[PDB]
């Protein structure tokens, strides 16, 4: 028969007899009306994971197979709204009239279905866009300790997509209802909700929903990619998603491994993150880029889930608790962070100036190990120290302050060619804003040419026009 009955009930897990023809991953319905997924198939029982309040289910209750895989609604109708892990509305603004539904579990695009990533995904952040570039189909990891600025980089990146054809999907996993509501008001304040979808599995929600959340957010991002548009997907913390899976697997009695996690956990995140890709022209040229986030305990990057996800991504941004209290505010470790796509992702103008910045910083990192004494260091060593201190300052940026790519180019160009070298270290931050206001207010042709050609080659005027500012301000 297709009818089963409950034989044990615990913390979101139930076990049942019968259900002989159920399939792995199928949805099952309890007599109370609540739903669950058939995860383990045994000789005489089925292990079911509950998708709601379990306190109403008792031993001897009837359970029925639905014959359906887990699916979520998709389309243009989800834009500027907040939904749970099953796509149901929680913003209080009424029903969602989506015309199509997609399973949360689908295969990633093949090797021949792809094309190399050649176009930039501007974050508006001078340390990322110059030294750790992101392309429009790349997976970049944001990693560091608690309270170091991890969500701020993801939110500033979503806010910068206003004048660009990118749909943004923000997936909150294991977050407090109060921080979700605080982030949603920040997105409305900056107008980012005109192109943003928010998916949220709260800390109060069962582990099964916190497990389904990244896959649902990914399915919504895929719809735009399959139709030739661009999409960005953020996972607020993959560490809480791994913890949610550890809970279900231990309660289902699957054998543990490293750091108590199930052996299956690499396949969990790799089956997710490989769905972010840039398609070939025969498939439509569409794209989906991902920004997963991970939290490290006391700086331990060598831990199981961190090393696992570091090996899956195409680059990593490292955040230091040390830089953050020292007054380097975005707090990015530029000498450790890396992107493979660097160069290919950037525009011709940005790449040129990124190069000199890279050599200057590399040399400064070599010299700073013994920078403890400076009155004794040779004057030549001082040139290396002074330049490095100034390039560090240009990278400092206030939260919610994305700088446009032409301006990032114009300022890195000035620091790398020594035009900011003569300015005093404390005065550099002031000089940066004043120079950008001067270039935009009078002779705006420099900013207009860089937007159109994207390749510079017109520097004689930029030099002469800069000397008129430095003459008295």
């Amino acid at each position: 028969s297709d009818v089963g009955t409950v034989i044990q009930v615990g913390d979101g897990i139930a076990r049942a007899h019968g259900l002989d023809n159920v399939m792995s991953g199928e949805l099952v319905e309890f007599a109370n009306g609540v739903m669950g997924m058939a995860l383990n198939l045994e000789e005489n029982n089925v292990g079911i994971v509950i998708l709601g309040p379990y306190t109403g289910i008792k031993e001897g209750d009837e359970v029925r197979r639905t014959g359906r895989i887990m699916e979520v609604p998709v389309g243009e109708e989800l834009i500027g709204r907040v939904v749970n892990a099953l796509g149901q509305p929680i913003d209080g603004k009424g029903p969602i009239n989506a015309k199509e539904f997609r399973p949360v579990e689908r295969k990633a695009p093949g090797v021949v279905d792809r094309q190399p990533v050649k176009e930039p995904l501007q974050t508006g952040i001078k340390a990322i866009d110059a030294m750790i570039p992101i392309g429009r189909g790349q997976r970049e990891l944001i990693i560091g300790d608690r309270q170091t600025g991890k969500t701020a980089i993801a939110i500033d990146t979503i806010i910068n997509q206003k004048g660009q054809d990118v749909i943004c999907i923000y997936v909150a996993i294991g977050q407090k209802q109060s921080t979700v509501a605080q982030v949603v008001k920040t997105l409305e304040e900056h107008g980012a909700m005109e192109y943003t979808i928010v998916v949220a599995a709260t800390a109060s929600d069962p582990a099964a929903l916190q497990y389904i959340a990244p896959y649902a957010g990914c399915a919504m991002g895929e719809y735009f990619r399959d139709k030739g548009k661009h999409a960005l997907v953020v996972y607020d913390d993959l560490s809480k998603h791994a913890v949610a899976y550890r809970q279900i697997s231990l309660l289902l009695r699957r054998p543990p491994g490293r750091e108590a996690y199930p052996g299956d956990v690499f396949y969990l995140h790799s089956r997710l993150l490989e769905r972010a890709a840039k398609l070939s022209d025969e498939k439509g040229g569409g794209s989906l880029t991902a920004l997963p986030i991970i939290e490290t305990q006391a700086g331990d990057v060598s831990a199981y889930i961190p090393t696992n996800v570091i090996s899956i991504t195409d680059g990593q941004i490292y955040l230091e608790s040390d830089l953050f209290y020292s007054g380097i505010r975005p707090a990015i470790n530029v000498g450790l962070s890396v992107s493979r796509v660097g160069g290919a992702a950037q525009i011709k103008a940005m790449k040129q100036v990124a190069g000199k910045l890279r050599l200057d910083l590399a040399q400064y990192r070599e010299l700073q190990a013994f920078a403890q004494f400076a009155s004794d260091l040779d004057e030549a060593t001082r040139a290396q120290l002074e330049r490095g201190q100034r390039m560090t300052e240009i990278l400092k940026q206030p939260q919610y302050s994305p700088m446009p790519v032409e301006k990032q180019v114009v300022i890195i160009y000035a620091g790398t060619n020594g035009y900011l070298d003569d300015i005093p270290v404390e005065k550099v931050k002031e000089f940066e804003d004043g120079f950008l206001e001067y270039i935009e207010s009078k002779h705006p042709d420099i900013l207009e040419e860089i937007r159109e050609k994207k390749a510079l080659d017109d520097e004689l005027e930029e030099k002469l026009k800069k000397a008129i500012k430095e003459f008295k301000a």
Partner: protein
Amino acid sequence: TRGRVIQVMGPVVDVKFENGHLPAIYNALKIQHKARNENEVDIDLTLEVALHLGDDTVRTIAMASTDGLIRGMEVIDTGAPISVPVGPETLGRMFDVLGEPIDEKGPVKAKKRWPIHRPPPSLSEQSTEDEILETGIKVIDLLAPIPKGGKIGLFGGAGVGKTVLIMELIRNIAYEHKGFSVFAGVGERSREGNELWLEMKESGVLDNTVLVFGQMNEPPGARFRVALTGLTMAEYFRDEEGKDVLLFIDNIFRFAQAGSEVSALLGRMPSEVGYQPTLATEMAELQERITSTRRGSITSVQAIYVPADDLTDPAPATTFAHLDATIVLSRELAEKGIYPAVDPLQSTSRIMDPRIVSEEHYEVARRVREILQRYKDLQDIIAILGMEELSEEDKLIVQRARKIQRFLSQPFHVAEHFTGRPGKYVPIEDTIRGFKEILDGKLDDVPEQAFYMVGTIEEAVEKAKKMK
């Protein structure tokens, strides 16, 4: 509907029932038995249903000692979870985990009883208020301002000062707001709990306060459910009366350990450092209910014990995600005599933004955190090379950081037995003015010893005069 005890294993008891008459999860059961002969003992015990096992059997957690239980004893089903009295009749009373009164005052006779397990507020009921609660404590008011309606967490090992810091906050905040107050005391000391009750009973503040205790010496069933009894009483004033309330909890770590002690006996597989697989879910069932809504507000001060001084431990680690402000207490500061011993580089709050606090406050806090980090980065160089080898800038940075770390110290009113000084209250204006005056170098010609144990900057200057 009745059943019988089948097994007894410390805090855990297994019970078997009649065909299809099984109790639901979280449901309360009662054991009332009188000794039939001199070999038995009288028992009055309450059990909570934890899980269904098959063979008409249920596994449960006992709320009091299981000593004297015998296999085959009759058990009765109450038909609902642990239910506790709610309403204005509960103000000025002391309670047990089961909501029964500890004080000799008589029966409460409240109009309604609420179940200990309730769903939290939905996303549309949440609030986004950004209002500063002034504490009068010079380190919290600068580096980690407390948001009204938010959660503030005190993290520390054994004997660093968590209880002395909670009791100074109780004294300073409950003085001027005159709202309803609740204290849970989940791991609170009976001696301190007695000192608190006597002061509140003589000062009249008890008439607006609810107390629940649940001492260290109790079994894990009581240490596990007691935080929810105090919270269920504080929720009534927010939901049905629309009031603004203070909820104090001396220890939420004990709530986590009580779940750990229980987990092995329930039949669960252990996780990292022996903890339960459900640790983050259990902490969220408690912490998601402690929020401000469109009806009223709950502000909460909580203390978290850090075992073996390791913040990477699953219990303290799981808790940080839920707090709006986090205060970490360091042994290195306590062993050096600097109290309250709050670590300036690890303490933070949600409210520390240029959009929520003044430009002068933001700039002073920035300059304090930076000078202390620069001083922390130099204690190795000062150990390897003589202090006469450091540059003039680093030399001044050390002297200013030395003055600042002790100007962060303050004598509390609740600590007069330990500090030997009267006790002081400092307003935000004098904290900002004080640190700015040291950072700007106006006080370079003043000894470091003059900044220790003084409430305000004018005091530091007369403390310098009291010494030629």
